[PDB]
Structure formats: C-alpha cells, structure tokens
Amino acid sequence: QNYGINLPITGSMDIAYATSTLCLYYPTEAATEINDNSWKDTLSQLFLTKGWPTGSVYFKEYTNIASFSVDPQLYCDYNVVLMKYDATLQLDMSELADLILNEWLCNPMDITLYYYQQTDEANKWISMGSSCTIKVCPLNTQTLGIGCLTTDATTFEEVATAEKLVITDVVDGVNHKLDVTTATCTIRNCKKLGPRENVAVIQVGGSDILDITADPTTAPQTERMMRINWKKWWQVFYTVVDYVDQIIQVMSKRSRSLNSAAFYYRV
Amino acid sequence: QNYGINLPITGSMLTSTLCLYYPTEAATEINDNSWKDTLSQLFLTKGWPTGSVYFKEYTNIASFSVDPQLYCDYNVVLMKYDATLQLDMSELADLILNEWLCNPMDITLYYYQQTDEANKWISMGSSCTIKVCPLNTQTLGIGCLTTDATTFEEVATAEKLVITDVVDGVNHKLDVTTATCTIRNCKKLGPRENVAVIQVGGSDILDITADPTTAPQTERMMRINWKKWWQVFYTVVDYVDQIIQVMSKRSRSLNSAAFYYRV
Amino acid sequence: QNYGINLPITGSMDIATSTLCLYYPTEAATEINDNSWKDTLSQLFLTKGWPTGSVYFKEYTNIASFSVDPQLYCDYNVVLMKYDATLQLDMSELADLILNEWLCNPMDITLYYYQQTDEANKWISMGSSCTIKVCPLNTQTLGIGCLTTDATTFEEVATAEKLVITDVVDGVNHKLDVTTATCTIRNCKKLGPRENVAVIQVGGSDILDITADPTTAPQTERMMRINWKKWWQVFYTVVDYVDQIIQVMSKRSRSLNSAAFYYRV
Amino acid sequence: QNYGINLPITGSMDIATSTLCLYYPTEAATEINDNSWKDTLSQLFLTKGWPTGSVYFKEYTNIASFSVDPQLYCDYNVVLMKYDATLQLDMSELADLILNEWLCNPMDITLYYYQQTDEANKWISMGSSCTIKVCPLNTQTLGIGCLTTDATTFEEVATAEKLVITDVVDGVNHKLDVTTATCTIRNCKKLGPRENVAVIQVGGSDILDITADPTTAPQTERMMRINWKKWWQVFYTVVDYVDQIIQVMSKRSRSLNSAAFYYRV
Amino acid sequence: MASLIYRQLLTNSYTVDLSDEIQEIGSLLDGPYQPTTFNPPVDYWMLLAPTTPGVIVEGTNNTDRWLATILIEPNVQSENRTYTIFGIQEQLTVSNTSQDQWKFIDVVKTTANGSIGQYGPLLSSPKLYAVMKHNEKLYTYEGQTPNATTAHYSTTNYDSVNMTAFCDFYIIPRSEESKCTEYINNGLPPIQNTRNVVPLSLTARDVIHLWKEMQYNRDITIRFKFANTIIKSGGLGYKWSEISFKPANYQYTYTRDGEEVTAHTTCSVNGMNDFSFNGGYLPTDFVVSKFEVIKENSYVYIDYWDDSQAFRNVVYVRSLAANLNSVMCTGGSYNFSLPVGQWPVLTGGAVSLHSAGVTLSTQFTDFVSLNSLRFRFRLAVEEPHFKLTRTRLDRLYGLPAADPNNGKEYYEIAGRFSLISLVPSNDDYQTPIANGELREEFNALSQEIAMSQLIDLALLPLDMFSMFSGIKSTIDAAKSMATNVMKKFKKSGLANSVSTLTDSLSDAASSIGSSASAWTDSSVSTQTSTISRRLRLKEMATQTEGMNFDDISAAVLKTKIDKSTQISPNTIPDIVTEASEKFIPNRAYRVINNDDVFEAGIDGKFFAYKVDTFEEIPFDVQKFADLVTDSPVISAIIDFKTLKNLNDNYGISRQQAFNLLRSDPRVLREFINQDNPIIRNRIEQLIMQCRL
C-alpha cells in the first residue's frame, strides 16, 4: 500500500490466471429527428437487457459541436460521444478530438505582463471561452521586434478568429508575447502527459479525417475513433446499443481514477 | 464427399468467366457502341479467349441493389461516389461482398427476434419503409402501442436497400408496406471471396461490418481516380493480373443468385 | 480447417423435421371449392408426423407462367403438373429444368460468338417472348445457309415458347439473334442429378424425357404417375404416402454444409 | 498496473520549472493604489530565485464569491484570507473544502432519498444561493417532527449562503428540499489531507475548525495567522519567508484540473 | 447423497398437474364498461349482459341492413309490446312459455327503412348474448341453451360495423372461445374474474401490474359503500324480477396527522345466496324471482388505493399482513312500490366483517392504472331478525340486497397494514421512493470455488427446501417457484432418457453381453462409449456407492446460485434444466470383479487393472457387459491416470488405495488437506468443465 514510489512487480508466464456508469453525449439533431419523449426509458430498458444496471445510464445534451467543446465534461466512467461530420468544421473537430482524448495536465497563465516560451512538442497553448482571438508576436533574444512592433497590439498576426476552442503551437526555444481579450475567454499553458483511454469518439458521415497528434509525421487512426454511415438516428442508437460490450472491451477504466495512482495525479 | 475440407490432410515441407458491371454514365459519356469489340480484342491480346468476358448494365446504384444477380465466377463491380448516398453504397458493398443465408419471414402475423451478433435483417424492394416497435414480456409496446402504426419509430423511409440491426435478444413487432418490399432474416456466414469492389472517387467510405469498433480494409476494396471513363477501363484491363491474383475461384455460386434461400 | 479438398474416407462393414412445400395448378383450386382446406391438410400432415405450420403451399397461374424461371426454396419439393395433350415438349423441358442442377454463365448476342464443348452442355432461354434464331459458321466466318449480316435467313428452333432448350453440334460456332428486351439466354452446363425435387404427373402417357440423348430413355424412380377425376382423391393419395415420397428423395446435396468451393451456384 | 503498491519497499537506515500562485482579495489591491505592483513582485521573486513566468496572481472578489467553484491552479497555493468577526463558519468551511482531498458523487433529489454510511461522509452544496432544509424519518419512512409531503415545516440548516457543509446523524435516511435552480448538492467522502495548498490569514484570532470533529481541532503547519495594518507589509513578509512555506508543503498531490473536489457518476 | 435433489425433482413433479389444473381455472374477461360508441375490432366477441327491459344492442350501417335486439321477460303471455328501435317506435308480438328465463329476439330490417320481423329465438337464465364479426361474415348466437350454434350472415362493410349497446358488455378474443361458452352457458360469471371491475370509462390498453428491504407500517381508515341493481318485470308493476348486488365506487378524503389523503375504494360481493319467493301462478300477484341475500358462505372484497410513501412501493412485495378490526353493518327499510294495496316492506338484516386475506389488485378511474391492495373479508351472521312482512317469509338471517346503505353514506373501517417492499439500491444510498450475458457471467464465475467445502457440501444431501432457502424471493412469485422448475424439469433431457429406458425395459419383457437385456443393446471404443452413455442413467437408480457426479453438479449449482445476483426468478428453471444435463460430459465408471477392475469412459477411454499393484490388464468387453448390468457402480472421480500417478509418485498404503477405488470421502479430503498437486489438478479439471 506504498502509494508514492514506483516499485517493480513480479509474475509468471505459465500459471493459469484470470458496477460502473455509462454516459452518452448526443447532438440536438437526433432529438429533433426522433420525435419520442419517453425514449430515455426505452434506452435504459434496452441497456438493462444488455446487462447494465437500470437507472444508471446518464444523458447529456448540447447545442452545437463548437459550443459543446466549451469546457468539456469528463465526469463519467465511459465517454461515448457522437459527432455529426460537417464539411466546414474540420479544425474544431480535430481540436475537440485532441482535447477530449488525451490527458492534459495544465498550468495557469497571465499574458498581460509576462513572457512565455515552450520547451517540447508536448507543450501547447490551449484557450477556451466564448470569443477568443489570439495574437502572437515572437521576439529576439534582446527583446526586440521581429515582424511586429512590440509597443503596439495591431501589427501582430492572428492565428485564430471567432472560435470557442483553439490549439496553437510555436517553435520551441524562443519567447513570445501574447495579446487577447480575456474578458470572454481564458487560456492555459498545458503539457500533454499521456493518452486517456476513458473516452471514445464515434464519427458519423464523411470519411476518416481526425488527427490526434500535432506531429505531421504521424496521423494514427487508432482504435478509439470509429466511423459509421447513417440516415436515421434510431439506426445509429440501435447499432451503438448492439455493440456496447465491444466498446467496453476496447476501453478500460480511467487508470488515474483508481486508488493506485492516489499520489501521482488524481484523476 | 470430403477430399480434406475440415478433415485430416497431410502435406509436406482460360474458360473461366469474367463479368464487368458498368454504369450507364460511362457509356453515355464515351458515346459509342463498338467499345465492346475493342475491349474483347484487348483481352484476347492479354491472353483471354474472346466471348469469355460478359458485360452488364445497371441504370443506378439504387436500381442495381434490387436483388443483384451475379453472372460470372470472378467479378469486378464499379460504383461512383455520391454526396449523400454513402449508407446505400456501403450496405450494397457489404451485401454483395459476403455470403448470406436467409429464412423468409411472415412479418405480417408473427413476431421475430435475432439470436447473435451474426444476425441481420435484410430488406429489398422498389420502395421500402420499415417501422418497428420493441416488445416486453407483457406484450405491450415500449414507447409505442401494439395496435396503432403511426406512433412507431422510423428506421428507414423510401429506401431501396435497408440493412439494419436491433438489440439482439428481445422480441420486436415490425410493420412495413409488404406489397412494395420484402423482409428476410439472414445470418452472415463468411467471406464471399469471388467479388471485389472498386471505388471511383471518394475517401474509403465502405464498412463491411456492423461492428462499430472494427472496420478493416481487405484486398478487394480499393480506390482509383478518374477524369474520363476510358482511363478507368484501360487501367482495370491492364492490371487484370493483380485482380485475378487477389480473388479465388472455388467460391462459385451453386445457382445464379445473390443470397441462398432457406438452406 | 477447410472443406473442398476431398480427403479419402474409410469406414467399416461391421455396423448395424424440415420444410416441405407443395405446388398445384389453379384448376385444382377451383375444383376444391373451399376456404379452410389448407388447415385441414396441415392437420393431416400433423397426424402423419410433421409439425404444424411447417408445410407451406404456393400456386402457379399456368404451366406457361410456371415456366418463367421456376424457383424452389424448400428442403423437400414435389411439383404437380397437369398433363395436356399438346404441350408435351413443354412438360419435358420443365422436368429437365427442375430435375437436374444447372450451372450457368451469362451469354451475350452482340459482341461474342458462342459455341458448345461437350454433350453435357445446353442452352436455356427464359422470358416473356423468346424467339431464337441460329446460324452455323465455318472457320473463315463465311456463310453456311445464312449470312451473318443478314438476319431473315436464320433457322427457327423455337418461337414464342415460354421455355426453350436447344443444343447444337459440338465443334462449330453459332451466332444468335433474340429479343433481349423480352427473353434471356444463358449458357449452362449440366452438373448432375438434383434430388431435392420430384415430379408427379396426373393422367398422361409417360411422355417426359429428361435428356436429349436418343438411345437412353431413363425412367427415374422420381418420375411417378397417377390417374384422377376429382382433385381431392389425388391430394389424399399424395398426402397418404408421404413416407414413400420422402424416402425416395434425399437432401439437396448442394445445400449441405459441404458448400465451400464445391461449385455451388 | 497498480504502480506497484503491493511489493514492499526496503532501503537502509544508514544510507547517505515550477509554479507558485498567490491569492489576494480585491480590496487589498484597491488599497495598494498602484497599477504595476505585479511587476515589482515579479522582480522580487526573481531576486529570490524563481524563474521568470513562474509566479502568477489571481483575484477573487469576496469570500462568498470565491467559494463558488473553487479553483487551484499552481503546484503551490498560498491564499490570503481576510477575517470578519461574523464569518467564522464560512471561513472554516472554505478551509476544510480547499484543505483536504475529496471524492464526491452527483445527486438528484427529485427521485432519490439519501442517507449516511459512516462518520466520514459530508454534504457539500455550492452555488450563488443555497437553502438546504432537512426532514429525517423513523424506521418506517414516516417524518418525525415534519410532514413528509409539506414544504413548510421542514427544519432549516442553511439559508442565504454560498458554501454550505452539512452533516446529520448516520443510520437514518432523509429527504432534501433545496432551491436547485441556483444550487447543486453533492455527496462526498474525505480521503485525507491535501498538501498542495496553504492558507495564511490576516488578522483573526486563530479560529479555524478545519474538521467537523467536535472533540479536537488539530492545528497543522499549513494554517497560520499574521497581523496587518498595511497590505504591503504582509506582501513583503510573505515573500521574504517563502522558503519556509515551500519546505512546509510538497508538490506531489497536484490534481489534473482545477477542481477542489473530484467528480464522479 | 447430494444427488438426491435430482431424484426428488422428477419424483413429486406429478403435483404440477394439480397446480396446472388450477392454472387452467386461472387461465379473464375484459369489462364491463359504460354504454358508449366505439369500433370493436375483428377477431373480438361481444358478451352482452343486460338486465333492464329496453332496446339492448343495435349495429348501425346506414347503407346495409338494420339489426335490432329486443329482450322479453317471462310471465307475459301473447300480447303486444312497444320498444324504441333506432329511435323509431315499433310494436312487437311476444309470447313466452318459460317462467324463470328471459328470452332474446333478433329484429332484422332488409335495409335502412325496410320491413320489420321477429326471429332468433334465444332462451337463457344468465341472459347473455354473443356477437362476432370475422372472415367476411357476422356471427350471432342461435340455438337453445346450454349447447347452441352461431347464425351466419354475409353483408358488406364488416370491419366498419360499429355496434352501440345499452348494457354492460365484455370483449374477448378468439382463443378464449372455450371460456366464452363456459362463461355464457353456465350462469353469470363472478365479478372478481373481470379485469375492469368498476363499470367506469373504457380503455382498450389496460395492463395488470442487489436490492434492499424497506418497511412501511401506516394506518388506514376505509370508508366503503354498497350498490343495488333493481329491475321491474313485465305487466303493470305487479311483480319484479331482480334485486341484486353490484360493484360500487367511493372516493373520499381524510386526515392522517396532517395530510388530506385521497382514498379510492371499490366494493364487490361473491358467492351470494338467492332466496326464491315464488308467488302464485296468476298473472296479477306479487311474485319475486330471486332475492339475493348475503350469508356465511359469501364474502365481500374491498380494493383500496391512496397516494402515500407506502403505496408508492407496492409493486414488489416481500411480506404482507393485515390486523383489521371488525366492523358491523346493519340494513334499513326498503319499501316496495305496489300500485294497488299495501306494498311489502323489508326490515332488519345485520352482519359483521372480518379480514382473512390480502393481495394486489387492479383499479382504474378515468385513464389512470393503479396497483391497489385487495383485502378479503369473511362474514358472520348476527342477532337482529330479518323478515319480509305482509307475506309468509319469516325467521331468516343475513342482510338483504335492497337497502344496505341504511342512510349512512359510508361505512368506516379502521386498521393498520404492514408490508415490506423491495427497492433497487445499487449502493447504500440513493434509495428510490417511487417506481443473455448471464451465460458468460456464470461460466466466468466458475473458476474460484474452493474444493474442500465443495466436497463437504456434496456430502450433505439437499432437498426441496434447502435449494431455495438461501435466495431472496417475492411473496407473489414464491407461490409458484417449485412448481415452475418442476414443470420445466419434467421436460428435460434426463426425463426423456429415463422415459426411454423405462419403455425399453418394459418392452424387453416380450448383443454385446451374455444375453438380451435393456443395457447390452475403434469399434470397441464406440460400443463402450454407448454403454457408458446409457449407464449414465444409473445415477437415478440409487444403486451407487459413495459420491457421484450429480452430487458435484448440484453442489456447484448451489454455490454459483448463491454467489450470483444477475438471475431473475423467471430464469432459474432454464439454468437448472441446462445444468442438470450439460454438466460433466466426460464421465467415467468402474466395476469390480474378483480383485479385477474394469473402467470405461464416455470419451472413448477403456482400461483394466488389478487392485494389488495396478498392473495393466487386457480389456474384455464381454465380462464388462455381463457384470455392469446388476452390480455396484461407483463414480470414477479418481480414474486410472490419477490413481497410477499417485501410486508411483507417492507412497500410499493399501487402505488409502482401496478406499480411493471406492472414492471414500474421508481419504479424498485428507489428500485435499495434504494439497497433493495431482489431486488438485484432477479436481480443478473436473470443476472447470462445469459450464453451460
């Protein structure tokens, strides 16, 4: 029960060896296209037939993808979230996939007075809010302007515009000075620690488009991103129901949530 | 009877047909009728006897889905991407890509349920629109009433081919305009390895399994790009070596039909 | 595992419920003149040893319409055909079409030039209006009693028949001309005996021939004859001897679990 | 797997970037009467030895407002709290809330009753306005001293508060009636101490009951008091002895996201 | 031993027949309802039951014929009577010879305004009418009671026929046809058999409706009433026909220490008596057909519903009890209305009510379905006299169905009821107040059971009581728990095997052994495997020594039943039936003959060895078949492989080996204690095979 210091374990390779909650996030389009109010009890009974305890399957609703990405909710044991593919919302889809599929340990920021820099590809700048407009101006070693007049907040270059969520990266090894109206939006300096297997994302419509890591060298279409076709939302609900066990087999309980990591990083 | 299929076996250490399904759009664009002779003679030069290559025509993907009739042993089918027809595209590819065994259903009178992950409901027809309501042990509809039909839940409307699944294990009462469609209970046995699908434009939309978490890409589901159909025809004919190496020939259908009937 | 590679078998010499469909002509339905007869026959079959609701019944408008691609979806089938003194060849064709496995490959009429290989090869044409006209050819593709460009000198072999079986001499090519908008011709090769069905004839005089072979007239045990004046007597007779009928037949060899690459249709 | 907590660790008796937050009230900044004090504090911290961009400043309007959705950002937290002779209960509740770890469960009072398991379960309600009224029951689901279907005679334990900690005697279920439109109630259990935080108060009389235990008030080294007349004296004396503060606490209990409690389902 | 649970399971199974008989008595009428307009669907019957003279029922077409029904009371000779047919008055001739049974007559108009006739002679004492519409023809009851037929007509617009009645009618599907005649030809069915007991508004959709125990002990103050139905016969009011009891409804309010509780109660009576006061045969005299009075062999039921935290947890009941206090009911005067002379007056009549049972019940008011509590009440006769003056009826006791209201608009009953409800508590908090994968889970759970305790339990036999005494049950379903499992068990594979063995044995009273017997009926391997498969049935013959396979199967079934929680009471029979057959396909048996042992395995194993030094012995099938027919048989838990490995690798003594061949529990458990790896391997291999 020594929680803190990692201790090596020992096992065997020949000896024979070897409840929770389920949430679901769905868009308002399905609600407008179902036309049945008591559907929640129907789904609960079906999941009971599948084996899950009744009265323990929660539901959440959101207006749009961009608005849902505003302060997302990890409060669940198995996130299974559906997303409607749009031919013009690709960047928000990618940033949402990045934000709710990896465990991001962040730090506070205050750009009005201080400098900032980055040291690794795990270092990223994440801003969340209702209206975020990022302005970026790199500086030289002697704190002099490079393509921007430091004394003015206009000659900069905008890396984001009219978005609720944004993920930005700059070249490691140089300092930067940031400008944005923090009244309706906040920003954090975050480091990507490890992959969180507590969430699953299933895509409907379109093709494979997601990219979970900013590295161009890899676009890993791992096995926590699925794709199905659809013309009636009831078909999608039934198909999801029929293979809940497979989704459970794919994922597992949140490792950080277990008492084992009570002193590394709580959940 | 058994030369070695599933029984012990000890080892050690020309006249075959080739069909080709093409949409009417290619013929209309190229605007010629002698191209059949040209392709036959090109095949002869490649090394295949003349008259051994059939050619069949389908008006639309929707129409071609109406009870497909295979006409060869080796088969290559062409389809064009559509903006909002990916469901039909993938479902048709899956249907004509795997073997099926179907028991006819008297949907009007009795009730039904599946038995395992390897069960699906297949419906084809000129105009199909299915509505289903789940049941309970008290024979009362859940979110529905067993008598009226309007208050049911839609699964497919005005669709030529519907491949659907429900919660397997509990009975359900279904309803449909039977006089304009047909519903059959089927089980997916295995891979029908004598048919390949070639995509013409798109981004690998096809999924050949209802499993959401698994969606492989086999050796018979490829993609090319097009600007004039003659390019596609020439590329297909020239690289017939790869295509004929990919598929097998021992999967011949015992009769000319897409799926077997009550066997 | 894998099937199809037939490993030799070795036994010894020291040892001791399914679907059943049935067809009938419309004249039988008119002569029956009843509504609940289906329930009566189903209960009779229940008495004889079959489950209730496991004996379906279908119908065909006429011998002509029954000939349009005769499908079968049963593990045990008996077909009842009413004899007519002028459609002898039609009955022979129907028997020879539904009695043996047929393996077909599609054939065009415009691009290619088809021929035949062996005596186990036939041509089958089915459609609403089937008019088949043929013309033999020589090696140099010249004219032999008919010109390729011409089409009014081709010899008829069958006109307006709902079913058409034809065969030409091996070793020579032949060109075709037939309305694709009303008829379909398929190049088919005969596999062997299809035991899934039997044929029972009412009246008649032993007319059917199950092959084009002249020197052989094989009277199969599956071909059986009776006599009738009221259809109910024939129905009772065929129901009574169900055991003999099923014992004569056997499972459809091409429908067993040995299908894998056994040249199933 | 479990990071290896099973196999014991044995040693020998004879063997031989960071972030720091600083929470301050708004009226302190108003009394400072300066616009660039943050830069001066940054320079002083740099002279102490912290890298630039490591010390961050946050603002909270009032004790009532800050307790709504408490947030801890840095790996270290030294909060400055002002004392009022009438807010002892709220200050103690805030200290308990952001001084110990918690694991909570969501609640929905429109369907379910609630109870207590042992003496390590507490009720926490947060929001802009929380009014919590309770009504216990006998061993047969009957209200004692309160009608179970009347929302008037329920006894009150909370009204016009932003941060409320509630506890009742275990072994008996209860019904809750709260204005859920502006509040949310959760069931939590305390897992132990949080060392990521530290509370320093100005004024006061060393009155902070950090536990619900009536018997004892175990004062620790993470809760201290300093006299004050002008806030710059406090700022200087808290940035001068920062090393002792760092030595007192540790940076090995940092949570993943800024939340005083761990949500569950 | 522990196998006895199997033997009893097929033994008392015959009792299910008795229960099944009761089940067929319990195997349902929909109604009655208010006289309204509707469209009763096809495949449904109309069971009408009027009591008041008038136009009974008519089906409107507006294009096809007019159907009218007229009911005629007895004691009326050949005269003319006026009714209101389709709103137009019409006279009809009536001539009746029967004196105690009413008669129905069908009136048919060939079109909307055709001619009028009277036909369709129906005579019945319960006065019941049956009308059906199915398969392009209309059915109506025709023929004298009790056994009759259905008149058939064929007129257009069948499915659009909407028949407006003026009485109480029941709607029944086709499958209950055997019920319908039994409920038509055999008197008025009891009211408790109905679904919607109260004749209030009609609905075509009525449905009869880890944990923690919750106890509710509250108090009730029931206020209930009675209801009379009075009809006047033909003539000029000189005689009546029926003065009967009918269900009543009462909704009121009261106080329960603060709450204005709304209590909804409905009353019914069953098994009443019918005193007959038969007057003179002259047409003009005071004659009463039936006088319904309540006596000791009759009961009154009350259905009670009210909103409360107790009543919102009644859907699942663990225990239920009643401690009511008896209440007296006394009747009042009921004066008849005789136009000439002095009318008779009923006086007296008093009874008492006591509680002798309680269960769940169904009740509806407008469209709200309820799960009510039905309290059964027994009755007692009392002191006050009950007589009919102006006549010769005197010295009778009971309570007449004329005026039991006695002015008071409610009868008070005060008592306390205690019930225990089961509520789904996934944890020890969030307790609600208002109201497949099991195969995989069972197969996965079967890897962690201990061995010594398993053997200990297999030593102690079970019975019909210990099997279900460790599992929680609902009192409503615990009534039929043994019955259902035995009914499903009598159709098990073992049942077919034992029936076939008995039939073959009996047929034998008309191979591989020495002669013909019912057990001698790789070739050696196949024959031995068949012999072993047939010998498996010997475990029901009580001819074994020591422990047997079925004991282990029963023990593991009990353990996994106790540990598991994902099984419903409706699921136990299937699990038991599947487990009693599929468990342990690899069985082994050995028999002993003159210091020699022969053993055969189902899988195809066969061996022979001596008891002294375990030397391999050549196999002789003939002597095996000769001896296994009638000789002791012992389950081969320790087969030859384990025995030989033990004799080689471990220095056992002769007593241990000899007991092992007999499978003595003591030495086997001693080996278990020693934790010998070979015995552990054998036991674990046996245990792992226990799965569906």
Side-chain angles (χ1 to χ4, degrees), chain B residues 3 5 51 54 250 252 254-255, chain C residues 3-4 6 106 112 261 263 265:
Chain B
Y3 68 93
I5 289 293
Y54 278 178
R250 299 292 295 180
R252 45 91 176 166
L254 295 79
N255 198 333
Chain C
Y3 320 106
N6 223 16
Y112 237 96
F261 215 72
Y263 270 159
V265 179

Side-chain angles (χ1 to χ4, degrees), chain E residues 222-288:
Chain E
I222 298 182
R223 306 182 181 181
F224 77 105
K225 281 266 294 189
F226 283 161
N228 302 120
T229 163
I230 57 180
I231 62 165
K232 180 177 300 182
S233 61
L236 202 51
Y238 289 92
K239 52 193 65 179
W240 293 261
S241 174
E242 307 306 321
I243 315 292
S244 299
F245 264 147
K246 71 170 184 176
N249 178 25
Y250 185 24
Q251 194 276 344
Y252 70 103
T253 53
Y254 67 98
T255 171
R256 198 191 294 177
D257 191 12
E259 305 83 55
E260 180 77 297
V261 179
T262 65
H264 195 89
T265 178
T266 69
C267 303
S268 297
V269 65
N270 182 23
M272 85 302 297
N273 307 77
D274 49 326
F275 294 147
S276 58
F277 180 77
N278 304 115
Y281 275 174
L282 219 55
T284 309
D285 43 16
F286 178 83
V287 186
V288 182

Side-chain angles (χ1 to χ4, degrees), chain E residues 396-555:
Chain E
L396 282 81
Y397 288 149
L399 191 145
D403 190 7
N405 303 331
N406 204 342
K408 294 192 295 293
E409 209 160 325
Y410 41 81
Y411 276 99
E412 44 88 15
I413 293 187
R416 158 174 286 188
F417 76 116
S418 178
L419 85 169
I420 326 292
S421 67
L422 306 170
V423 185
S425 65
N426 47 16
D427 302 78
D428 284 8
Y429 66 91
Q430 208 286 304
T431 297
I433 52 178
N435 304 84
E437 56 201 33
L438 84 168
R439 332 276 184 171
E440 287 184 348
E441 294 212 11
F442 190 96
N443 297 332
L445 188 139
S446 176
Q447 203 187 8
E448 309 178 11
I449 58 177
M451 342 299 168
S452 53
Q453 290 71 270
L454 161 71
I455 287 299
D456 295 331
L457 202 151
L459 187 73
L460 175 137
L462 284 73
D463 52 357
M464 288 301 304
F465 165 75
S466 173
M467 179 58 62
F468 324 99
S469 56
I471 176 63
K472 63 184 304 176
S473 56
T474 75
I475 185 180
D476 193 13
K479 314 169 184 178
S480 62
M481 188 174 180
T483 302
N484 283 278
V485 302
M486 297 185 95
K487 173 183 173 300
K488 295 304 181 64
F489 185 78
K490 74 190 292 292
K491 301 177 180 178
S492 300
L494 196 73
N496 266 7
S497 296
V498 66
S499 185
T500 48
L501 182 57
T502 51
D503 257 2
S504 184
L505 253 173
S506 190
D507 195 13
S510 61
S511 298
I512 207 61
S514 65
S515 301
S517 66
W519 309 71
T520 180
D521 203 312
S522 296
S523 58
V524 160
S525 70
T526 58
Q527 295 170 328
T528 48
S529 67
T530 55
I531 290 183
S532 59
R533 185 183 305 176
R534 202 179 327 178
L535 266 169
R536 181 258 171 264
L537 197 37
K538 265 290 190 180
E539 281 301 334
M540 312 307 296
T542 75
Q543 296 176 28
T544 67
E545 295 186 344
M547 63 205 58
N548 302 312
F549 292 135
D550 37 9
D551 309 71
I552 301 187
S553 71

Side-chain angles (χ1 to χ4, degrees), chain E residues 28 114 218 223 445 447 575 578 625:
Chain E
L28 301 183
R218 309 304 279 251
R223 306 182 181 181
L445 188 139
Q447 203 187 8
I575 292 183
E578 292 158 325

